[PDB]
Amino acid sequence: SNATAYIIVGLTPKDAEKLQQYGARVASTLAKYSGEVLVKGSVEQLHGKFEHKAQVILEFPSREDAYNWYHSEEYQALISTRDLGMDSQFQLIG
Amino acid sequence: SNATAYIIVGLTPKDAEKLQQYGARVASTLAKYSGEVLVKGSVEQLHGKFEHKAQVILEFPSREDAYNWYHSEEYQALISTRDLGMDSQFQLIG
């Protein structure tokens, strides 16, 4: 009944150590915007092409809350190290 | 809990009428495998690059059903018309 919003990530691991620093710190950043990991996992290609190894999907209670999470100061501090840990794409939907 | 599985499509519309036809047929193919559309929508890009205009996420009760759906007889017939209506990528997480 509400307009649930989603962030889709498409990713490829680079630096393992850095990727684990990133992953460790993020979950906290989500709970202020009521973020939640719907699924994560490796890709099996069913059609077309896709440049990435794995996908993660975040779920928020509202588009505005998804956008605000990505743009929060607590998440943004995570970014320089996220990019060392993985090349990715993020898409906001909703 | 069970291991709910997902199909993520990223798409770019081509022929609106071929597309209409596709869209109008897929659903009946979903029910067979307990498929459900989690979400449909245009993309605002948060980070990095993404070739498509829009994403759709499909939710199935398992990876078996998700794969069986895509490779099902009745969905496979919809493909020819699908590919005329849109360029797309289908990823299987599950």
* Tokens (6 digits) for A75: 């998440």
Question: Are B88 and A47 a contacting pair at CB < 8 A?
Answer: yes
Within an 8 Å CB–CB cutoff, is residue A43 touching chain B? yes
**Which residue out of B7, B12, B45, B46 would a mutagenesis test of the A interface target, given it has the greatest number of A Cβ atoms within 10 Å?**
B46
* Tokens (6 digits) for B43: 């993309």
CATH topology of domain B1-94: Alpha-Beta Plaits (3.30.70)
Contact predicate A16/A84, CB 8 Å: no
Chain A residues in contact with B38 by the CB 8 A cut-off are 6, 38
* Tokens (6 digits) for A20: 């684990």
CA torsion, ordered B47, B52, B56, B57, to nearest 10 deg = -50
Domain assignments of chain B as residue spans, ordered by start:
1-94
Strand A86-93 relative to strand B44-47: parallel, antiparallel, unpaired? antiparallel
* Tokens (6 digits) for B91: 């990823």
Burial call A69-83: b when 16+ CB within 10 Å, e when fewer: bbeeeebeebeebbb
Task: Measure the CA–CA gap between A70 and A65, rounded to whole angstroms.
Answer: 9
Task: Measure the CA–CA gap between A20 and A42, rounded to whole angstroms.
Answer: 17
Q: Which residue of B has its CA nearest to A46?
A: B90
Question: Are B57 and A55 a contacting pair at CB < 8 A?
Answer: no
